[PDB]
Structures are given as C-alpha cells and as structure tokens.
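Objective 1.3, modelling of assemblies. Example input:
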Amino acid sequence: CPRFLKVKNWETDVVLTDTLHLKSTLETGCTEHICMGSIMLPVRTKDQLFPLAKEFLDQYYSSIKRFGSKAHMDRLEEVNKEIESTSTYQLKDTELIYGAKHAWRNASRCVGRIQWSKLQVFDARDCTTAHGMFNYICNHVKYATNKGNLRSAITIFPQRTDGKHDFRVWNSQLIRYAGYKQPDGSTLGDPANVQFTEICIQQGWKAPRGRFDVLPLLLQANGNDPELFQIPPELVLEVPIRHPKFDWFKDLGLKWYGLPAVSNMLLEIGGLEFSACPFSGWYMGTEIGVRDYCDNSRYNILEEVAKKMDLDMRKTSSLWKDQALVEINIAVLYSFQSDKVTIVDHHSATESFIKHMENEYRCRGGCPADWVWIVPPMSGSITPVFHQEMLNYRLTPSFEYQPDPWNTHVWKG
Amino acid sequence: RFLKVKNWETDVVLTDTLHLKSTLETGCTEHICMGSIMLPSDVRTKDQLFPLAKEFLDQYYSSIKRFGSKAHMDRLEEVNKEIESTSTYQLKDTELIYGAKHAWRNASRCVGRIQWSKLQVFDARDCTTAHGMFNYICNHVKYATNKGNLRSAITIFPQRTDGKHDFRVWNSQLIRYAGYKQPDGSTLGDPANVQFTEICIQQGWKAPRGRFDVLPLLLQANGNDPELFQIPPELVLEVPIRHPKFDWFKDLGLKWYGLPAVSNMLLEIGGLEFSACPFSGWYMGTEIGVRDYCDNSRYNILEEVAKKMDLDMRKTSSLWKDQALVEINIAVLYSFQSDKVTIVDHHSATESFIKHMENEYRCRGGCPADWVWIVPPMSGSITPVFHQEMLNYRLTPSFEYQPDPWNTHVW
Ligand code: HEM
Ligand code: HEM
Ligand SMILES: CNCc1cccc(-c2cncc(CCc3cc(C)cc(N)n3)c2)c1
Ligand SMILES: CNCc1cccc(-c2cncc(CCc3cc(C)cc(N)n3)c2)c1
Ligand SMILES: C[C@H](O)[C@H](O)[C@H]1CNc2nc(N)[nH]c(=O)c2N1
Ligand SMILES: C[C@H](O)[C@H](O)[C@H]1CNc2nc(N)[nH]c(=O)c2N1
Ligand SMILES: [Zn+2]
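Predicted structure (tokens):
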C-alpha cells in the first residue's frame, strides 16, 4: 500500500499518479505470486453491516459537502438504530441515486464511464410481484430506448433480506435472441442462449424457432418461482443490418436490438445487496460486429461474409478474417446511424474514456480500470487505451457477479 | 492453491499446479492488479546464491531423470564448494543449454514458445573484448538468418561477476533503424530511437541521416567503455514492402528487417546473471504492420495509406483506420512470403500457442502467460487466445528487464 502509484501512457509519455487505490476494500484475486488479471470470474450479519453502512454514508455526506454535519451524524444514528433493531436498513432516495451512479463510476470493466453522472434511476423498491417487475421493466425499456435516442437507466428492485426472498431477473440481459440446438447438432439463433431458451420453453414459452426471436422475461419476486412475460414487440427496437457499399449484405438477413441492458448483476450499496437491478446504456459497435456476429461460439458469420467478398480463404495469412471483420463492423455502425439509433464506434469510445480517466485522476485521485476488458476486441493498438497503463482495484458501491438463479433457486412448485 | 483456467470459446478447463513453484513476485497484490503495467519493479552474496543454484540443479537433474542420484549429489557438492571458495560458480554446457531453453519456456509474454525446445545456444563465455562480441554477434545473425529460413538462436556472453565488469549490448535489439531530430521540427526514421541514435553519434557514428539506417552495435565488454561496430550490410536481410493488390504501395518506400533479435534483457540461470544475451526468432506479422508501422509514436503511416486508398477520413466511424490497418498487414505478410523470409501471421501463431498451452498443462502442470502481451494488437477476439484465461507468474530460469546501460555506466 504505497501512498502513490504511477501509470504511464506509452504513446504520449503522460504519467498519472493514483491515490484513490488506498480506498480499496474488496480483493482482486491476485497475489504477490500470481496475477489473475485475465480471469473472467475471480446472508450478511449486522456485525459486518454497520461499518459498511458508515463507510458509505461518510462518502455520501462528503460528496455533498456535509461531512460531520448534524444531518450526517443524525443519519448515522438513525441507520445504526435501524440495523440493531431490524438487522438491516433502508436507503434514502438521494443515497440510492448516489449509490447507483457511483457503482457505475467504479465499474472497472466499463469503457463508457464518461457518462456515469448522467444516469436515470428508477426506484422500484415498492415492487412486490413478478407482474409488478414486468411493468417496471417495460417502462425502463421504453424510457431508455426513447425512439432510438438512447438514455442510460437503471431500475432497482427490493434489496436482499434473508437470501430466501430474492428478487431476480433470470435473463442475463433484458433483450436477447433465442438459441435452439437442432438434433443434427447445428444451432438456430444465438448459440450462447440455448440453455436459457430451454428453461423458457420448459416454463411454457411457445418458441417461434427463428434466427432472431426476442426471448421472454423470466422474473422472480420475493423468492417465489419465476414467471414468464413477453416484452411488447412495439417496445423492442431493432436495426436491420446493411452495408454502405455492399448491397448483398442485407440479404444476410441480419438485425440486432438497439438496447444493451445487463440484468444479472448485483448492486452493492453500503452493505445492502440489490440482486435485481437491470441497467442499460447504448452499444459500442464492436460488441455486435465483433463479438455477437463473429465469435465462433455466437452467430459466427465471418465465413459467409468472406465468401461473398470473394476473399482468398485458403490461407489465414491473406487476413481474410480481419478484412471481413472490418466490413461487418462498418455495416453495424452504418445501419444504426442510418436508422438514428444511438451507437458509438470503438475509436470515439476509447478516446472519450482516456479523457474521462485523466479527469478522474485529477479530481478523484484515480480511475480503476481493467485493461483486458477496456481494450476493444478488434484493432486494439490503434486505439489509445491499448497504450495506457491501468490499475485495477475494487471500490464500493459496486456491481458484482452473482450465481445464475437456476443453479441456486429452491423451487416452490 | 490448485487453480483452474477456462477457455470461454471452447469451455475447456485446465488445472494449473505449476504456479506453486513460482519464485519471483508479480507486482500485483490482493488489493491491486498491475497486470497492464509494462515494467513493475548490486551483487548476489554467497548465502543468496547457493539456494538458487540448488533449486536449479534440482530441476535440471529431475529433467534428465537422475534426481537424487549420485551424480546429482556430486554436482550439488561441487557447486557448493565452488561458491564457498570463489563466491560464484560456472555452469556446465549441458546446464547452460537447459537453462537458456527454459528461460524461453518460462517467458510469459511470448506467444511463440511452442518452439522453445528448438533453440540454438551459442556459448560465448570465452569472450573478452568488444571485438570478440562483434564477431560472435555477426555469426549469430548469419546463422539465425540462414538466407531467409530463420532459426531461433541465443548467444550468451560472460556472466556478471562483481557488477563492475558487466558485458552489455547497448542496443535494445540487434537490428533497428535510426531516428533523427529536425530543424523542420519533425522526425526522420524511427522516432523511438532518437536518443540511442544521438548516443551513437556522440560516440562517433557517421550517420547517413536516412529513413531506414541500420544502427551500429554499441558493445560493452568486461565493464569497459562501449565500442561502435557496423554489422556487415550483407548480413542484414531486409524486405521491401509491397501489396498483392495495390500497386501504389511500393511507392511508400517501406522496408523492414527480417531478424527480430532482443539484446537488452538479462538471462538468469541458477542465480547467475547473464547481462548480455541477445536472442532471436522470427516475426509475427502484426509486430511490423501494426506496431512498427502504425503506432503514432513510431513510423505512423496510417493517414498516408488511408489517403492512397481514398477512404473517408472525415469520421472515425467509417473505420478508415481499421481498413488501412488490415491492408498494411496484408502487405507485410505478402512481402515476407514472396521474398521467402520466415514470418507467421497472428492467426497461425495464436493457434500454435493454444496447442502449446494444452501441451504444457498436460506435461508440466501449467504455462505462465501474460494475456495483455499474448493477444495480438489487432483482431483480438477472432484469435483463440482472446477467449483463453491465463495465469501469469514468474518461474526461473528467466529473461528479465535491466536498466539501460547509459544510465548506469561510469566512463
Ligand atoms: C451509456 C453508454 C455505455 C457504454 C458505451 C458502455 C460500454 C460498455 C462495454 C462495451 C462494455 C463491455 C460489455 C461486454 O463486453 O460484454 C461494458 C461493460 C460494463 N458496463 Fe458499461 N457502457 C455504457 C453504460 C453503462 C451503464 C449505464 C452501466 C451501469 C449503470 C454500465 C456498467 C457496466 C458494467 C458493470 C460492465 C461489466 C459487465 C460485465 O462484467 O459483464 N455501463 N460497458
Ligand atoms: C521463433 C519464433 C518466435 C515468435 C513468433 C515470437 C513471438 C513473440 C512476440 C510477438 C512477442 C511480443 C514482442 C513485442 O511485442 O515487443 C514476443 C516476446 C518475447 N519473446 Fe518471443 N518469439 C519467438 C522467439 C523467441 C525466442 C527464440 C526467445 C528467447 C530465446 C523469445 C523470448 C521472448 C521474450 C523474453 C519476450 C518478451 C520480450 C519483452 O518483454 O520485450 N522469443 N515473442
Ligand atoms: C462475458 N460476456 C457476457 C456476454 C456474452 C454475450 C452477450 C452479452 C450481451 C448481450 N446483450 C447485451 C449486452 C450488453 C453489454 C452492455 C451493457 C451496457 C450497460 C452498455 C453496453 N454498451 N453494453 C451484452 C454479454
Ligand atoms: C515494449 N516494446 C519494446 C519495443 C518497442 C519498439 C520496438 C521493439 C522491437 C524492435 N525490433 C525488434 C523487436 C523484436 C521482438 C521479438 C523478439 C523475438 C525473439 C521474436 C519476435 N517475433 N519478436 C522488438 C520493442
Ligand atoms: C500499457 C500496455 O501494457 C502496453 O501498451 C502493452 C500492451 N500489450 C503489449 N503486447 C505486446 N505484445 N507488446 C507490447 O509492447 C504491448 N504493450
Ligand atoms: C479470458 C478473457 O478474460 C475473456 O475472453 C475476456 C477478454 N476481454 C473481454 N472484454 C470485454 N469487453 N468483454 C469480454 O467478454 C471479454 N472477455
Ligand atoms: Zn494482477
């Protein structure tokens, strides 16, 4: 724990000094003997709860310039009594909004954080049933989509109590396409969603069995068995994919949804755990064009595209894969822009992230960042983040991973 | 303590036990990960040296299936006596070769390690002068180049003694191009070599002030002041860069050297330190086409190529940078292949490394790997290493960074 750590940008020689890392609480997974930097995935008693609450409230009252005020001390007193009496406590609306914005600010794997202070927070802590969850999520989807002019948002459902009454969205993302495993081993739709699609089918979903079927919401309230709901199609904004020069690209039959919305993570604020907290922003082009379309384990279209460009596919050293990859990503950006749906290219997004990061070092004393996730999955070193040294550490409030609900849920019947 | 790594493309999970043998530290802690830091953070004494020797001799004699044998114990005793008596010791040829091959095997930032056992080791421990060093290095360069059919090699000069008599190659690579300032204010040649080029000039180099001037070697023997030598031009194989479809590409006047040879690292074996140990393999295309040619702080040619292709350079979202990048890298590979000079593309190299990883996990119980360096600087996720979890840890024998000699050297 040196008081100071420096990071260097090897393109510009800009050096920054991190002090924020001293406020780090959680573990990284690394030790002095091993680095787990590329590892994807490396109730609560009142004893451990009041320090977490106090730490959070101190940060909140500092940020509003009321540290040590009567208001601050009264709040600490109030939360303390509430914890020792009820074993938990409730956040004020202001503290909830602060908490969610800062969990985003602290998200070291997110390149989009220049936007963190612009987040619409929907307080759904009065929700009690799956039907109510469905209503709240429809409203979030409509607000966030904004007819293509996307707005960042998060909807926060009631916190965990004894761990037996959890709210969960079983979908990993609010909008996703179904995947179907055929008897011959082939896959229709999104191969990554085969298992979840099967769960949905088992729960009674009638699958149209096409290549781009929007999955139903599977929603769990208060620890009850989850229930199926179909998002109104008119709320699901989609973009057919075409290419500005290649007129055959449309006949690939590709489209994607406009709203990226993560729904399987846990929001921790002041020791409290919000197990259902779907959040959404707008896409960076490579997410679709590189990963969704071109991962071997996803739609995997590099082959067909390269064929239609008539590239030399007999030797990898022709770089036919790289050539097709670029065209596909051009087409995604082109399509979204043409239909006036918010999207950002990986050049713009990484450039903005560097400006954000430098701003954060100056005003906050640091910006935790995961290089392995921040660097885009194509053209890495012609973006500025590639050459930027980053320190990764964990601040709270935070977004955390949690087990998949189908592995832990106790079925009521 | 027994760690698992998962491939998220194939769902294959491997179990690493080799990390438990890790000696050196990572830079990371439980509170902060320094995985993206390029460089995280004086003789050895008698007491420090003998356990290092034993650890090494133990793994050597294990490797030849004679662990705990008479010859094993005999060698341990002999080295022990030699250290006690002379405060250092000398490696047997067999041990030197083993150690060098395993330093490569342990290089966590190297994607090319499937080749680790096929390394030609040149023992230059009898070298005493800078002229001797020059001769050894010329022979290395000729052997490794092999008229375009490259062969991996390392040349190992005398080990550090009291630290006052270090052998050093002052160049960071055996072959690189000069960089010059401008009254124009711009930069001619390789911008990353302006400082070194000035030192060469200050030491008396006659610079032709061109865009691709092979730098002279600056060689330091036995702690003496470094001396200048020019590598015979006919030993430095270069490749003119042309494109298989774009006839205008040759007009850029681009070329690059065929031999990638690192000369500024320190080789540690059994606690002994070899401060001058140039090694060489063959290029992966992206090294030249992505980094050397398109880094903004390097030859920075993206804009020029983009213009020749007549792409829309008004908006970043047209991905004109990305399109030019691919074409530049197509040309590099095409040029090397056409001139019959060994090169590997990033798809081929990363596929090899995945096979090497699986081999190492199966027969060794792990493979230390730095994902940040192993994933190529373009088209990351369409190479298999992107989806491969890797554990990074430090085994010896190893190649280590050391301070640049011009900051340490007392003249
Ligand atoms: C507003 C525009 C945004 C952009 C352009 C953006 C960009 C990205 C991208 C490209 C990723 C990587 C996704 C992946 O590879 O699976 C990511 C990850 C992440 N983002 Fe952002 N994001 C945005 C908004 C948000 C918001 C509103 C939140 C929360 C309130 C957020 C929190 C996170 C978190 C927690 C991750 C890690 C995801 C994981 O571990 O699976 N982001 N972001
Ligand atoms: C024979 C084919 C080889 C290939 C294709 C290959 C590939 C690579 C590449 C692409 C890098 C990254 C270099 C950079 O970005 O600056 C690298 C680094 C490295 N390689 Fe290999 N290499 C080969 C041979 C060797 C040999 C023969 C040795 C040692 C005897 C070696 C040891 C290392 C080390 C220590 C690094 C890290 C160097 C640093 O930290 O700057 N490699 N290799
Ligand atoms: C570790 N990868 C998790 C994963 C795999 C496959 C697909 C996804 C995924 C599916 N649909 C939407 C997303 C959106 C991710 C995201 C979230 C947010 C808030 C913003 C943004 N630009 N991107 C991811 C995630
Ligand atoms: C951290 N980057 C150090 C650096 C910066 C700029 C240029 C270089 C460089 C220059 N010339 C040759 C190299 C060769 C690296 C290498 C070594 C070996 C043994 C094999 C290989 N394929 N590639 C690197 C290295
Ligand atoms: C800051 C970051 O660590 C730095 O730019 C690294 C990234 N990955 C790299 N990977 C390789 N192979 N070579 C490099 O020089 C670098 N540079
Ligand atoms: C094993 C490795 O950590 C894994 O493939 C990571 C690499 N970097 C990533 N980066 C982003 N943004 N998203 C990802 O899913 C991944 N996957
Ligand atoms: Zn680490």
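Chain A has three domains: 18-125+152-162+266-280+350-374, 126-151+166-237+401-405, 238-260+283-348.
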